Design a protein around this ligand. Sequence first.
Ligand SMILES: NC(=O)c1cccc([C@@H]2O[C@H](COP(=O)([O-])OP(=O)(O)OC[C@H]3O[C@@H](n4cnc5c(N)ncnc54)[C@H](O)[C@@H]3O)[C@@H](O)[C@H]2O)[nH+]1
Ligand SMILES: NC(=O)c1cccc([C@@H]2O[C@H](COP(=O)([O-])OP(=O)(O)OC[C@H]3O[C@@H](n4cnc5c(N)ncnc54)[C@H](O)[C@@H]3O)[C@@H](O)[C@H]2O)[nH+]1
Ligand SMILES: [Zn+2]
Ligand SMILES: [Zn+2]
Ligand SMILES: [Zn+2]
Ligand SMILES: [Zn+2]
Lengths: 374, 374
Amino acid sequence: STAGKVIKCKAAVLWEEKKPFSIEEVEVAPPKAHEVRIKMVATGICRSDDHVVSGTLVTPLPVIAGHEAAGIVESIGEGVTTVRPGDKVIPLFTPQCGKCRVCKHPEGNFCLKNDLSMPRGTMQDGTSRFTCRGKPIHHFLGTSTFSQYTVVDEISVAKIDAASPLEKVCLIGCGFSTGYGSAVKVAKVTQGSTCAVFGLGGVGLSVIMGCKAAGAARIIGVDINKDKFAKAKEVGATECVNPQDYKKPIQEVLTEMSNGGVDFSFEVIGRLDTMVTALSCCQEAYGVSVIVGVPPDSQNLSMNPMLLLSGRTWKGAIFGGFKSKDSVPKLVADFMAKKFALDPLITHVLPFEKINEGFDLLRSGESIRTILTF
Amino acid sequence: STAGKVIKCKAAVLWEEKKPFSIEEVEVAPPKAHEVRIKMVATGICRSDDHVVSGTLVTPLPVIAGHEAAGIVESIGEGVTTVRPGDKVIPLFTPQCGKCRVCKHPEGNFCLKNDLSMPRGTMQDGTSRFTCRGKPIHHFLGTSTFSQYTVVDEISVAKIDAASPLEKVCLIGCGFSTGYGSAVKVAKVTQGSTCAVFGLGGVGLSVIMGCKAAGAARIIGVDINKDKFAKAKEVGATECVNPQDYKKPIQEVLTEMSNGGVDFSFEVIGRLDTMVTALSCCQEAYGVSVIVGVPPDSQNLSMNPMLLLSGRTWKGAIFGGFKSKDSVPKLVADFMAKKFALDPLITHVLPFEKINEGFDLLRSGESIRTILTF
Ligand SMILES: NC(=O)c1cccc([C@@H]2O[C@H](COP(=O)([O-])OP(=O)(O)OC[C@H]3O[C@@H](n4cnc5c(N)ncnc54)[C@H](O)[C@@H]3O)[C@@H](O)[C@H]2O)[nH+]1
Ligand SMILES: NC(=O)c1cccc([C@@H]2O[C@H](COP(=O)([O-])OP(=O)(O)OC[C@H]3O[C@@H](n4cnc5c(N)ncnc54)[C@H](O)[C@@H]3O)[C@@H](O)[C@H]2O)[nH+]1
Ligand SMILES: [Zn+2]
Ligand SMILES: [Zn+2]
Ligand SMILES: [Zn+2]
Ligand SMILES: [Zn+2]
């Protein structure tokens, strides 16, 4: 609650990998110059949060994970000029400093001030802003939303429409904007095409949302979990295929299906093998494959270059190509206009304290987006 | 000489790999329906022909190689509607049947009627047209220009300007069009950019011509053969770097000098390691790397997918993305208009019978384009 100094509150501290979170009490310092303390209204559980724990996404531990969320501004640090206190806002795991090459470039969005390439697990000041027990707790992507309170740089915050249903709109902070932006922005799906999506999770379903918004005539969802098929078709898919039903490789099954290959295929899972399979399954001469999943730390994939030579283009993208600070508020306005719907991504809405359970729903395959309410 | 039936002539027969070409006599059968027999005026020695002999580019032996050339039409088979006898023309290693998905696709150029991905070593009808000693000989890419006379399908030949200088314009059938097409068509270099070119041979120098035509503000040519630098700077390079001069990895060097990365990188060598290196030396968030070199048969390259997650786009292409039959004629016209120049690429012009020598000049790094005259 209200302040101008240290706050004590609950947070999901992750002490070690392959362990559960420990909802604990933390001291959340006040916002320094150019930072903001935000009161977390709702939080989505993205697979990336799960990667931290399983050790596939290496970041410094202990740490308060969480990054897909929406909240309200409790206070503002010296100089902040973009968000006033009481404003509904959305943190940003991909900032938008406005000064580096990337923010200046009309196309790139992966700002040089991100904490994803090389995790420090600190604030821009290179300092923390959390303490549990006596020890300091690392940040995550300069967001860390698994806490009632958090403080992010002005660089990583976006003022959102006052009438926003923060319990829906938090998805736009990762899951949706990524998948929808991969399809409509990075890959640039065209009316009439035929896409293929690998991974029918929250982002996967969001890519199908983009393709369908882009006008793809066919949308082949691929997943080893038959249960994901209905949500898929509901949001946009035209058919769904499960690798395990076939006696011949999926790229073969897909090429045959597409009469030679896909127009645009997407890897929204995270494994090396499916990264290649997604590439190979697209048209050798003009197919585009967009890598969306995040692979396992320091692992190299092997693929034969002829796949590229023929004319295939392989792209990768973070946050769906979107320039964070400009995009999110604009995206929210669209949600308002009803130009899209986040409902189909939402399958559970547990309360913060049951975080470990929402993660269990993920890894078991019975959920999609599970919204932690605070 | 003129006919309507078998013609006996000279040709460079490749009997086995890692062996010299054998200049000998062949019976070049007359053109079947929709085929064309052509009299070879001039031919260029492209690195690919050399791959064949090294075994890097697996194609069936024995074979009459060659693919970049211009000639005049001796005879035409039944139904031919595009070229008459006496027209100056250019065979095309990249077909353009006009009926397949690719040819119909406004963007892709790699025709489904090509013999590059799955080298048969025949004509469209699955039959040869060359007989040496007593046994039949395979064709190459459906062109095979290292013969005084050859027969190409109507789909693999382009009629070019009657007044075109065939011993210059032959370069347009491969080396030029690909290098120039990679940069202007494929990667779409932009005014002001900073491009980097791996390999300063015929195709590379043509890419430098592309980048410069596109308006790149900086073009850094990389090559281990110091000798290649003057010509490179000559065609448009702004600077030249040689891997062996530095004590630190080339991508690190390029990135440091380009202030965090190049806008467009090109790989025109065909080496696996430099295919990755060229990828990594480009801007993490918006860099585009186009692979142009042709890799060693069945070899897989290992690379960290995170490289693409950041935002990089990896492209690959054959014939610079130019749609063959419609492009060549138009490009030739541009030559005539003095829209570009092939002269700098030509450093030797040996007579056909000196083929094995022109090949030595390649392997010894002292040539670029050695035009063989017939
Ligand atoms: N680059 C970015 O901006 C960005 C954004 C968001 C998430 C990510 C990454 O993308 C990935 C997925 O995100 P999510 O939607 O939250 O995760 P999720 O766990 O909800 O979905 C994973 C889906 O993949 C399916 N899948 C898994 N294995 C296979 C397989 N072997 N073959 C076929 N299908 C399979 C699985 O059944 C599930 O439906 C994950 O790797 C995450 O780290 N990156
Ligand atoms: N994709 C297509 O449609 C297409 C068209 C034309 C050529 C090609 C392929 O492109 C490749 C280049 O053709 P080229 O220009 O005719 O051959 P080339 O020998 O003239 O050019 C190769 C250049 O690579 C340089 N070089 C070699 N090793 C290295 C290295 N380790 N690091 C840096 N530089 C090095 C070498 O000095 C030379 O200047 C060749 O492999 C050919 O098979 N592909
Ligand atoms: Zn996420
Ligand atoms: Zn920035
Ligand atoms: Zn060539
Ligand atoms: Zn075709």
